[PDB]
Amino acid sequence: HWGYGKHNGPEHWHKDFPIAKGERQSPVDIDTHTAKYDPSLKPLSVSYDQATSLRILNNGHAFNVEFDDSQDKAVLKGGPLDGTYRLIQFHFHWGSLDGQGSEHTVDKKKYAAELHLVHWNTKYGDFGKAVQQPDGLAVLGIFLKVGSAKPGLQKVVDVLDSIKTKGKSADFTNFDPRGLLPESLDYWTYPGSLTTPPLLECVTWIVLKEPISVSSEQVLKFRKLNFNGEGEPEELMVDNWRPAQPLKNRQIKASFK
Numbered sequence: 001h002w003g004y005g006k007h008n009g010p011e012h013w014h015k016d017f018p019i020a021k022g023e024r025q026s027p028v029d030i031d032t033h034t035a036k037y038d039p040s041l042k043p044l045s046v047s048y049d050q051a052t053s054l055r056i057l058n059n060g061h062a063f064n065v066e067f068d069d070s071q072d073k074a075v076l077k078g079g080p081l082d083g084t085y086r087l088i089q090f091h092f093h094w095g096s097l098d099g100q101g102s103e104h105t106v107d108k109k110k111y112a113a114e115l116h117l118v119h120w121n122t123k124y125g126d127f128g129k130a131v132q133q134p135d136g137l138a139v140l141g142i143f144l145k146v147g148s149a150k151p152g153l154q155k156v157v158d159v160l161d162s163i164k165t166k167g168k169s170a171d172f173t174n175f176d177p178r179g180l181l182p183e184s185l186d187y188w189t190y191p192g193s194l195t196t197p198p199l200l201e202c203v204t205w206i207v208l209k210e211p212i213s214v215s216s217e218q219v220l221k222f223r224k225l226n227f228n229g230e231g232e233p234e235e236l237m238v239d240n241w242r243p244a245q246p247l248k249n250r251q252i253k254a255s256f257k
């Protein structure tokens with residue numbers, strides 16, 4: 001099964017998922033100088049006031065905080081998007097060291113981690129149908145750098161001991177994802193893919209310019225999770241990031257100058 005180890009990591013994924021060598025794969029390096037400012041890009045609309053988190057799950061490749069997406073409770077609109085996209089889950093990718101961990105890079109710079117808030121286009125009715133469409137998902141990507149703590153992340157950090165191993169889930173209600181957002185919603189955007197198998201080319205990527213800062217203790221607790229299931233040999237869940245993929249025939253647009 002695919003993973004991030006020596007024999008099943010990202011360079012192996014194309015054998016099971018040939019779209020890995022596709023024309024709109026993610027993540028990518030964001031060359032800030034080559035990104036073009038687009039004045040027709042609208043500001044992003046993040047409407048998270050009514051979000052209903054339900055639980056948190058270790059799926060063996062990251063942990064997902066899952067939301068009730070059966071109504072327009074937490075939605076993303078505006079920006080490059082047409083229509084309304086509902087938040088279904090968020091998760092992170094992170095490194096074994098503070099110097100790596102993000103999937104997107106900015107002028108080749110790697111951040112300590114990257115948060116992905118995953119949304120699906122309501123015109124397709126549910127997530128499973130949306131991922132089959134070229135405009136099915138909008139993923140809001142937010143970089144994490146190590147510095148001061150992010151208070152809004154602590155409730156996530158504190159529950160991770162209850163989902164250490166693959167397959168464990170925990171009730172995780174009343175979590176407000178607004179506590180994970182930076183001050184500015186300036187963004188880059190490009191058409192891309194899921195960054196884990198099945199690598200489907202269904203994502204409008206919206207990557208925020210401004211990182212959030214989290215503490216060293218906060219990211220250290222991510223690194224205590226396990227890829228393995230309980231009662232299997234312990235392999236720390238670290239470096240669960242795919243490296244940058246060829247931009248090919250794509251242009252990254254910026255909402256700011």
Ligand SMILES: NS(=O)(=O)c1ccc(O)c(NC(=O)NCCc2ccccn2)c1
Binds near residue numbers: 139203
């Ligand atoms: N890392 S990412 O590009 O934000 C992202 C977002 C939503 C996703 O469903 C995935 N991929 C993922 O979760 N793979 C395991 C479950 C899955 C997801 C989609 C279709 C089939 N199976 C990646």
Ligand SMILES: [Zn+2]
Binds near residue numbers: 093116195
């Ligand atoms: Zn992701």
